[PDB]
């Protein structure tokens, strides 16, 4: 049980999970992860996937919950985003909502589909504008009152005004507006309850690029909502992610986000972190490797051993850079293109270990770094843009180490410059 944000997560078949824009549903002790299948690197509709698990980590892919229909707004030339599914007790029916759009995002509708079983397949009922207004990024929140009253959370009015509106008793349509934040430019919403209070997590509108996601709280869905506050250090842009789903977990929650990769959408990653409420304000716990016990409502952060890149052995043209965003105030630059750094005396008990690479990449585009263990064949690790040359994020790589001391060499045999390497943490 290791949740490793940024890694290529695979289902029980060993295939990369394709469930972007997550919606989670719990039925009894089984969890259902619905999402966008982007396996052909398209922004257009291929499927709403359905994966099941009892532990939130080992996901078994079922038949797709929603499939395209030519000549409708759920054709393979249209947009189906951010699916969400809730169970209607009155009708014994699962109801899926999603953002339904054209490829230019000019239609701004919701779509609804229904099924008698959690993975369906679902039957599409049509798309519409809620109360006649725009809806783009959306979520569905189901309260725990007696009626299990449900709400659409949505970016409206050309993304400018954020709305919460109550659904009818069938969950088929929006009946009344409940809250509006005019001019808020919020998207990617989700709500999770905590000690009877409602917590809204949302991003701002920066297109595909990540931005600092925010939390708001209220004692009623009608508000008043608190003023936005950060869930993560602002410079990290939510640790390079965008909110997708906020799952309750005991007295805390799990932040489930997407790391969108526009040039390779099917390789967009899943950024899941504990959302810790112990201070009364929710905050992402930046845990490169953590474990979850969904039955206990608990999480456990793995401990690792840190090695500073600047304490490694540089070869060729690599150099030491100084900056306030780096651990130890220093990083190794000019890696790749003839510069290397080798971190020696990496202790291990043997076997396979997750290693987090902390780097800064001030480009607008990705870099990568070659990684070789004890002189073995290199693997190439993608290094997203980090937000600035003085902003560090981490990405994980699983390395086979030997008992005793090990060496890890970065930047050998690549023509391009890698990102600047701050440190590594070996878990
Ligand atoms: C949904 O509810 C609204 C407001 O109550 C109503 O005007 C509308 O006819 C209903 N149906 C649809 C498809 O919007
Ligand atoms: C590695 O990074 C360079 C840019 O520095 C890029 O041109 C190249 O396509 C990347 N390689 C892979 C496999 O992504
Ligand atoms: Ca450092």
Author numbering: 22 to 448
What does the paper say about this structure?
The exo-β-1,3-galactanase is a glycoside hydrolase from the basidiomycete Phanerochaete chrysosporium (Pc1,3Gal43A), which specifically cleaves AGPs. In this context, exo-β-1,3-galactanase (EC 3.2.1.145) specifically cleaves the nonreducing end β-1,3–linked galactosyl linkage of β-1,3-galactans to release d-galactose (Gal). In this study, we solved the apo and liganded structures of Pc1,3Gal43A, which reveal a glycoside hydrolase family 43 subfamily 24 (GH43_sub24) catalytic domain together with a carbohydrate-binding module family 35 (CBM35) binding domain. The N-terminal catalytic domain consists of a five-bladed β-propeller (Gln21–Gly325), as in other GH clan-F enzymes, and the C-terminal domain (PcCBM35) takes a β-jellyroll fold (Thr326–Tyr448) structure, as in previously reported CBM35s.
